[PDB]
Amino acid sequence: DDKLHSQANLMRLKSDLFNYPGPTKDDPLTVTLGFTLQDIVKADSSTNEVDLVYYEQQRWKLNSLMWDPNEYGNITDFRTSAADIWTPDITAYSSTRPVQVLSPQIAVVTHDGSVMFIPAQRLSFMCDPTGVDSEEGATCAVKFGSWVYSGFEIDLKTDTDQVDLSSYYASSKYEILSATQTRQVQHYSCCPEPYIDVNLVVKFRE
Amino acid sequence: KLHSQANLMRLKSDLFNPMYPGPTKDDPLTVTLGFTLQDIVKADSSTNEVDLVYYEQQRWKLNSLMWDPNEYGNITDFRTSAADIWTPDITAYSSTRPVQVLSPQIAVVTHDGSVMFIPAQRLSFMCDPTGVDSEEGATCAVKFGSWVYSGFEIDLKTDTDQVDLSSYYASSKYEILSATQTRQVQHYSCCPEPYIDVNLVVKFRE
Amino acid sequence: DDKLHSQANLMRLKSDLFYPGPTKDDPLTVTLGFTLQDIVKADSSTNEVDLVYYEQQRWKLNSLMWDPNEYGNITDFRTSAADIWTPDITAYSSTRPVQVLSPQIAVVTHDGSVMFIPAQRLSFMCDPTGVDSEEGATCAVKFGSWVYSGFEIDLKTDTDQVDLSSYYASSKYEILSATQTRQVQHYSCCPEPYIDVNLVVKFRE
Amino acid sequence: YKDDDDKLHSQANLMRLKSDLFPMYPGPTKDDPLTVTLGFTLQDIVKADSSTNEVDLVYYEQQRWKLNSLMWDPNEYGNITDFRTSAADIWTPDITAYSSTRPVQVLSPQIAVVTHDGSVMFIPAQRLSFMCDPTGVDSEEGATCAVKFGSWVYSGFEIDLKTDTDQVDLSSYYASSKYEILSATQTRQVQHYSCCPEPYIDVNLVVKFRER
Amino acid sequence: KLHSQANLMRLKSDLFNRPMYPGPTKDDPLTVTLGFTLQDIVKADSSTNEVDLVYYEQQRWKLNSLMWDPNEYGNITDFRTSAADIWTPDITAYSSTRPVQVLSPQIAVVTHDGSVMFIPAQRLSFMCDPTGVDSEEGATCAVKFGSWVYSGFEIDLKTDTDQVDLSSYYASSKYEILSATQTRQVQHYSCCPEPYIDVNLVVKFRE
Numbered sequence A: 001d002d003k004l005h006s007q008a009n010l011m012r013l014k015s016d017l018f019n020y021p022g023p024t025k026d027d028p029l030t031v032t033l034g035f036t037l038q039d040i041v042k043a044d045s046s047t048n049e050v051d052l053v054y055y056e057q058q059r060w061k062l063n064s065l066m067w068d069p070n071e072y073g074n075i076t077d078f079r080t081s082a083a084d085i086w087t088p089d090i091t092a093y094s095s096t097r098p099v100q101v102l103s104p105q106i107a108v109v110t111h112d113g114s115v116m117f118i119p120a121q122r123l124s125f126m127c128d129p130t131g132v133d134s135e136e137g138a139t140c141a142v143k144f145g146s147w148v149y150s151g152f153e154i155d156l157k158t159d160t161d162q163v164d165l166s167s168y169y170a171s172s173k174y175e176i177l178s179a180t181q182t183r184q185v186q187h188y189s190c191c192p193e194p195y196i197d198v199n200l201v202v203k204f205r206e
Numbered sequence B: 001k002l003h004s005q006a007n008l009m010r011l012k013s014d015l016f017n018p019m020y021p022g023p024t025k026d027d028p029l030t031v032t033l034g035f036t037l038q039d040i041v042k043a044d045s046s047t048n049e050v051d052l053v054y055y056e057q058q059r060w061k062l063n064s065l066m067w068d069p070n071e072y073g074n075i076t077d078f079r080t081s082a083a084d085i086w087t088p089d090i091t092a093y094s095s096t097r098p099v100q101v102l103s104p105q106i107a108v109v110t111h112d113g114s115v116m117f118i119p120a121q122r123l124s125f126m127c128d129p130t131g132v133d134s135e136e137g138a139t140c141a142v143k144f145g146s147w148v149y150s151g152f153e154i155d156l157k158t159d160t161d162q163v164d165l166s167s168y169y170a171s172s173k174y175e176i177l178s179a180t181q182t183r184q185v186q187h188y189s190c191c192p193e194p195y196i197d198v199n200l201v202v203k204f205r206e
Numbered sequence C: 001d002d003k004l005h006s007q008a009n010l011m012r013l014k015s016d017l018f019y020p021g022p023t024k025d026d027p028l029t030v031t032l033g034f035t036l037q038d039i040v041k042a043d044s045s046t047n048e049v050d051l052v053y054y055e056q057q058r059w060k061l062n063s064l065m066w067d068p069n070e071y072g073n074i075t076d077f078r079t080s081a082a083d084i085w086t087p088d089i090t091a092y093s094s095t096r097p098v099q100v101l102s103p104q105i106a107v108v109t110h111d112g113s114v115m116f117i118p119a120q121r122l123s124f125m126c127d128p129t130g131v132d133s134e135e136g137a138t139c140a141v142k143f144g145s146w147v148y149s150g151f152e153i154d155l156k157t158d159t160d161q162v163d164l165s166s167y168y169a170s171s172k173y174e175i176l177s178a179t180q181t182r183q184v185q186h187y188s189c190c191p192e193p194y195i196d197v198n199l200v201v202k203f204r205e
Numbered sequence D: 001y002k003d004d005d006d007k008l009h010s011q012a013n014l015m016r017l018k019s020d021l022f023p024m025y026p027g028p029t030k031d032d033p034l035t036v037t038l039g040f041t042l043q044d045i046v047k048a049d050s051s052t053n054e055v056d057l058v059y060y061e062q063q064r065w066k067l068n069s070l071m072w073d074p075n076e077y078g079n080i081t082d083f084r085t086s087a088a089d090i091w092t093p094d095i096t097a098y099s100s101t102r103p104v105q106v107l108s109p110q111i112a113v114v115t116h117d118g119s120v121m122f123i124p125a126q127r128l129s130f131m132c133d134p135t136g137v138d139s140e141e142g143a144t145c146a147v148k149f150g151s152w153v154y155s156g157f158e159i160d161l162k163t164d165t166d167q168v169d170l171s172s173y174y175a176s177s178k179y180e181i182l183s184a185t186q187t188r189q190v191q192h193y194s195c196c197p198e199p200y201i202d203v204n205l206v207v208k209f210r211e212r
Numbered sequence E: 001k002l003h004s005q006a007n008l009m010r011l012k013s014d015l016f017n018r019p020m021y022p023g024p025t026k027d028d029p030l031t032v033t034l035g036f037t038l039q040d041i042v043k044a045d046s047s048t049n050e051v052d053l054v055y056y057e058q059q060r061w062k063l064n065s066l067m068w069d070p071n072e073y074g075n076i077t078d079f080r081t082s083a084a085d086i087w088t089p090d091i092t093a094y095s096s097t098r099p100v101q102v103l104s105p106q107i108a109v110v111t112h113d114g115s116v117m118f119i120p121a122q123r124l125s126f127m128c129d130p131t132g133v134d135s136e137e138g139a140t141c142a143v144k145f146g147s148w149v150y151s152g153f154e155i156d157l158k159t160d161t162d163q164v165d166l167s168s169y170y171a172s173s174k175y176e177i178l179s180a181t182q183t184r185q186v187q188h189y190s191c192c193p194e195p196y197i198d199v200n201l202v203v204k205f206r207e
């Protein structure tokens, strides 16, 4: 009965929350982004493509997802399918293959309205690995950002400019020399609204 | 702020509630098409296939998607999944693999009824790269157009005949010597009505 | 108002129109034709060949007939191929799942004709020995219904000559000839005859 | 007009049959077990990969079973004796290759033929990569490989798996294959594990082949 | 026989209309037992340090909400159901380099005490340096499996043994197995007061 009780309290919370159209200029949203780089799998010098495996941490906060734990049996967080909630359209801008998702698509929602979503991904992107067989290595970069929302609708932030490297694969064919993730504001001539991306820059060698 | 979210939900609800059944000879449609070439990833002379990554910009305008911003809290635009609305069946005529989609598929609808849809794609198509190792380079071409709508239903237009190369990957294995996109009208033995395509012609070398 | 009127006539038509497939009492004729675009690849290590082609399919249902005069003079419309019955026509010696290159949309006309032309890439069983010679190599593949006999689905072509007017002029392979021949198979097992179209292609580097 | 009405009449009778056929069958059980007959038609050995010991087969897998819940009297349904239906509309057995190395690839539509006595015939074409050492294929004696097929989750108390013959049908084998078949058999096997009182049934496909 | 089918359908209707199970929580936690049956090391790629494994992954858990008295249901003790019809754990490989490939139907066995048995066959590419596979000591690689979003306070992981089942290992694989273990690990992250659990698969092999 106590188990049924706690299950009922969670079902009641989720039912209440699921009964938000995305950010707008009137209701903008900040998304925090961070990369945990696991592996440089392949560097292909015949096509100038490089394959990364990483965890992409995304976090945003919505008033529509807030609740008072006292009103819901002291539940402070829950797990739901990422398809049950809005998620940002953050995309690599210079990929050469569809990203491959390696993990279940499940987000964690906290009572303050906070959402954490961390998909693991394999990405092929445009990168000339010339010099990777040298001491100074090779340098490659790829920008991530919303596909359809400007800086007036989604702002992008990092908690740090240092890519988390504490899970990089120790026996990779490639050693990481540096890995940074840097927010950039762009002003294009096409458009008066600013655009935001996070630039991932990785220096590596064999 | 719940007010602005409610205004956007009211607009979307009004718009989604005659449904637009696609264009016809009595209600024809003009689709504007343009390419922004990012990369020639691979040119395979053993099979005469070449792989291209590009943005394909598509734009059209529908009365049924118009609204007065005054009646909807001055909302001027919104975002919706491309699967939630009619989109044109623009197709490469001479691909050799199903096109790969590299971006979210989200359209931007604006209050004048116009729709902007810009998928990023990777495409393999029939292309003989003989001469790519020479100064004159190699020239290839591929037509894009509606698969099943004639020019009396979907007409195509370009805003320029010059393919934008400013996002072309500077360290590609191949450099672009020229890239044009040209509207064509074609009649076919099969079918009584002309079909419209845009011919994408690219000249490139190592 | 005029554009809303025509959109409403189309939606009324589609609504009114929206069959358990064919049977021996209610049989169906499918017309089939091939437009061969490219022999992409001829793999002598596995005796597989990859073709790219348009496959014209056409059939007629009384259940999709209408009088244009009752529907604002509409003579035809477009609809998703997953919204209507389509025949189970299949290559009999493929070695990979066919790859679909075109959107799956059919044309329907007021006489009840359905018209469907998927672009496709097909790997199929083919020994290319001889392709590096003047006589070339020759390969064949049969197309037909998977589960319907000739008493349920009859296959017809409009001609035995494959359409080569869109063959890729710079292919690695040149086409010496390409034919698409209706065949009636009579088996002793079964009272019903079976029907395929045999696609025969002779080609060389 | 009369012809039109005859056509609609037969259509209505078939729609009535399928609507009538569709207590729902919940799959087989120890109380209501089921026999599934399995036979293979080998079309082609496409590829033998000696660097990974994987071999690729194209074949038709014939499956047959009979359900009381699919019977009907043709007299009650306009003399209809059989119909075609998508394999997703009915229960189908979970017959699986036990040592595949890639997901099976389906090459044909997934359509079953249901006959008025309740017998179902389902013949999908498939491409399968499975574990196989091709050492000897470049010799006159050839190489021999095997793969077991069986239900993934039903024991012999729920699904009895049978063959009609040990002889794999080779009459459609591709005459210009890179590999010629020396023999191919399909044999029912019963395993008992001491863990569990229930038997477990597979059909073992054994193929001996060599470079052409 | 119609009566036994109606009993099974009655049971399945009663279980699937029960409040709905929302997944495990701190207050309603769950233990998942994991075990691997290793069939084949298909491929070891030294140019990318990726290795491909084929295995069966046994998963077992128990839910109050799937319990029933066989006496109320014609002595039915178990049934088969699609894995999409029940809650299943988000068990994931932490260092794969391609999406896992599923080789078996996604069907589970549910038992009257509420236990679920689900055993997918899988092909997995994961991060592994095969240097030494050409030698007598062989090479050694490891990959963790665990929930993707659930802590040890919601999903505990157990193995029934630490010895990977090698009884179905392919005898003519390009590679032989020197040893293979599956070890529960308790993992503490500075982010979080709750422990995280994984099962570490360690395989030593050689040509």
Ligand SMILES: C[N@+]1(CCc2ccccc2)[C@@H]2CC[C@H]1C[C@H](n1cc(Cn3c4ccccc4c4ccccc43)nn1)C2
Pocket (backbone or CB within 6 Å): B093, B145, B146, B147, B148, B188, B190, B191, B192, B195, C035, C054, C056, C057, C058, C107, C115, C116, C117, C163, C166
């Ligand atoms: C290249 N298209 C194809 C070219 C083609 C096409 C047939 C051979 C050889 C190159 C795409 C591309 C644009 C132009 C023609 C387009 N198109 C759309 C359709 C639909 N359609 C049919 C389909 C099957 C059978 C008959 C018809 C039919 C009859 C009248 C009007 C339209 C028809 N047919 N062709 C298809």
